[PDB]
Enzyme design. Structure first.
Site, mmCIF file in Angstrom:
data_model
loop_
_atom_site.group_PDB
_atom_site.id
_atom_site.type_symbol
_atom_site.label_atom_id
_atom_site.label_comp_id
_atom_site.label_asym_id
_atom_site.label_seq_id
_atom_site.Cartn_x
_atom_site.Cartn_y
_atom_site.Cartn_z
ATOM 1 N N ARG A 1 5.495 15.325 14.360
ATOM 2 C CA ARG A 1 5.220 15.372 15.795
ATOM 3 C C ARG A 1 4.908 14.006 16.423
ATOM 4 O O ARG A 1 5.088 13.841 17.615
ATOM 5 C CB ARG A 1 4.106 16.368 16.117
ATOM 6 N N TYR B 1 4.639 30.059 4.404
ATOM 7 C CA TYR B 1 4.853 28.737 5.027
ATOM 8 C C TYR B 1 5.765 27.811 4.216
ATOM 9 O O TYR B 1 6.344 26.890 4.773
ATOM 10 C CB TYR B 1 3.508 28.032 5.296
ATOM 11 N N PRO C 1 5.369 20.829 3.585
ATOM 12 C CA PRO C 1 4.449 19.794 4.087
ATOM 13 C C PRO C 1 5.031 18.370 4.178
ATOM 14 O O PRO C 1 4.746 17.673 5.154
ATOM 15 C CB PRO C 1 3.299 19.843 3.079
ATOM 16 N N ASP C 2 5.847 17.974 3.193
ATOM 17 C CA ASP C 2 6.458 16.636 3.129
ATOM 18 C C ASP C 2 7.853 16.503 3.752
ATOM 19 O O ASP C 2 8.362 15.390 3.834
ATOM 20 C CB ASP C 2 6.534 16.151 1.669
ATOM 21 N N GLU D 1 -0.255 34.118 14.029
ATOM 22 C CA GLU D 1 -1.563 34.097 13.358
ATOM 23 C C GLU D 1 -2.601 34.700 14.300
ATOM 24 O O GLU D 1 -2.436 34.643 15.523
ATOM 25 C CB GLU D 1 -1.992 32.666 13.020
ATOM 26 N N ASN E 1 6.668 24.911 13.318
ATOM 27 C CA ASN E 1 5.308 25.441 13.420
ATOM 28 C C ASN E 1 4.417 24.393 14.078
ATOM 29 O O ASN E 1 4.110 23.394 13.456
ATOM 30 C CB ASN E 1 4.741 25.822 12.040
ATOM 31 N N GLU E 2 4.040 24.615 15.336
ATOM 32 C CA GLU E 2 3.108 23.736 16.055
ATOM 33 C C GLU E 2 3.515 22.276 15.965
ATOM 34 O O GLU E 2 2.701 21.430 15.604
ATOM 35 C CB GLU E 2 1.670 23.867 15.502
ATOM 36 N N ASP F 1 -1.903 27.130 20.932
ATOM 37 C CA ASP F 1 -2.404 27.758 22.149
ATOM 38 C C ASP F 1 -3.143 26.752 23.063
ATOM 39 O O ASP F 1 -4.246 27.003 23.554
ATOM 40 C CB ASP F 1 -3.269 28.962 21.751
ATOM 41 N N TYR G 1 -4.577 35.770 9.766
ATOM 42 C CA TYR G 1 -4.682 34.541 8.969
ATOM 43 C C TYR G 1 -6.040 34.577 8.249
ATOM 44 O O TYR G 1 -7.067 34.543 8.928
ATOM 45 C CB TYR G 1 -4.572 33.300 9.860
ATOM 46 N N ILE H 1 9.587 18.120 10.745
ATOM 47 C CA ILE H 1 9.661 17.294 11.945
ATOM 48 C C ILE H 1 8.241 16.756 12.182
ATOM 49 O O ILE H 1 7.295 17.527 12.368
ATOM 50 C CB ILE H 1 10.180 18.079 13.168
#
Length: 434
Positions: free
Chosen positions: A100, A65, A94-95, A233, A133-134, A175, A265, A98
């Protein structure tokens, strides 16, 4: 030498070993220790400890990741190649992602993506990059997804106009039933397309079945999807030890014709009960009961694929619907580093990077027009300076208030220690400017 891991390539909706011609199926696991991320693939003592355990497990792919692009990765990447292992890599950290809730596609994030691409693209066992990612995760933030499409486009552009192998760039999604069809369609619609598509798939819990889990329905809805699709995952932890019986379904004849496998995962146990190993206080590996179940399932799994030689013999975007789908087909433009760099030279009032953004944007945007920095993924309206950094955008509005006030006394109209008068703005890049 990376002879044991020839580059994988995409043809139609399948992966293929570029030298053998055999269809490639992912038997993976997520591998991420929780800079302010830890980059185990930049630390030989960590990766060389874990790879023998990964080998026993029987995986051919890791999902990572976050890597630190300022560090070397050839030792761990060569050690992975020696055991036939590939890497799927997220471009964000993480920092620098994008957001959301307040989506942007800007110079800061684009530079992170480029640096990761520069650090990792020479490795033939780099399977693919995730541009997201999500990001969109439910019906209230689907307007984030145009920012991700722009990132896929620009990441592919940058890989294209470079010396590297054309490593595919894809997306990883959640999902949520109300958004999942629209997301799948959106990422293969119009002129910009993801190269592959992973789902974080936790529908099969405990001793489920193909017909009761939702897997059959998922398989039927992704049949004929134009790009490779897989489980980025899996491994619901309802029952423990996790049986991993979903693995038999995933690599069976019904699912192997649609899905290109998946990644469990995850490797490390981290207070969430998803590990197959636990790192002890000696920093050694303790095998957990999950490991043996996953090991046994992957070993039985023998997906029936097709050869590339055999296999060889744009779609409409979802309509806008308020409350349901609000992703405009018109994407933000490629961020312009040189244009945004000019704000650092010309603006009278600057602010050094930091809660205060939301506060200071609310304040300044009541006193000046902020249209020039707003990005709207619903309507496809992107302000002229909407691609600049979070600090440049704020600096612009503060500088606008300073000039509007007119005092011309070098007192920047916001009381905060990070605010300062930019002495460079008194000097004579581009007069294109505002």
């Amino acid at each position: 030498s990376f002879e044991k891991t020839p580059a994988i390539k995409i043809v139609g909706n399948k992966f293929f070993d570029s030298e053998s011609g055999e269809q490639f199926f992912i038997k993976g696991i997520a591998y991420q220790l929780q800079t302010s991320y830890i980059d185990a693939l930049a630390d030989p003592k960590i990766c060389l400890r874990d790879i023998p355990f990964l080998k026993m497990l029987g995986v051919n792919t890791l999902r990572v990741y976050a890597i630190d692009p300022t560090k070397s990765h050839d030792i761990c990447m060569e050690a992975l190649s020696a055991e036939g292992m590939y890497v799927l890599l997220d471009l964000s950290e993480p920092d620098i992602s994008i957001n959301r809730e307040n989506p942007s596609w800007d110079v800061h994030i684009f530079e992170r993506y480029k640096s990761v691409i520069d650090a990792m693209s020479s490795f033939p066992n780099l399977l693919g990059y995730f541009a997201g990612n999500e990001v969109t995760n439910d019906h209230t933030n689907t307007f984030a997804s145009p920012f991700v499409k722009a990132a896929i486009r620009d990441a592919k552009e940058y890989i294209s106009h470079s010396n590297h192998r054309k490593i595919p760039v894809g997306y990883s999604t959640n999902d949520d039933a109300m958004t999942r069809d629209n997301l799948a369609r959106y990422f293969v619609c119009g002129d910009v397309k993801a190269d592959f598509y992973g789902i974080n798939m936790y529908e099969w819990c405990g001793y489920s079945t193909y017909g009761t889990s939702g897997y059959r329905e998922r398989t039927k809805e992704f049949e004929g999807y134009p790009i490779p699709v897989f489980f980025s995952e899996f491994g619901c932890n309802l029952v423990r030890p996790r049986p991993f019986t979903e693995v038999s379904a995933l690599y069976g004849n019904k699912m192997s014709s649609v899905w290109s496998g998946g990644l469990a995962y995850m490797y490390f146990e981290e207070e969430n009960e998803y590990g197959v190993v636990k790192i002890n206080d000696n920093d050694g590996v303790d095998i957990l009961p999950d490991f043996k179940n996953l090991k046994k399932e992957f070993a039985k799994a023998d997906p029936k694929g097709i050869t590339e030689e055999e296999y060889l013999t744009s779609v409409e975007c979802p309509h806008i619907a308020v409350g349901v789908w609000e992703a405009n087909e018109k994407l933000p433009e490629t961020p312009d580093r040189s244009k945004c760099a000019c704000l650092d030279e010309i603006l009278p009032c600057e602010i050094v990077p930091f809660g205060k953004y939301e506060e200071y944007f609310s304040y300044l945007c009541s006193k000046v027009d902020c249209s020039d920095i707003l990005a709207n993924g619903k309507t496809g309206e992107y302000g002229e300076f909407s691609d600049c950094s979070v600090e440049q955008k704020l600096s612009l509005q503060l500088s606008k208030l300073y000039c509007k006030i007119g005092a011309n006394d070098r007192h920047c109209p916001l009381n905060d220690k990070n605010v300062y008068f930019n002495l460079e703005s008194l000097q004579p890049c581009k007069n294109v400017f505002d």
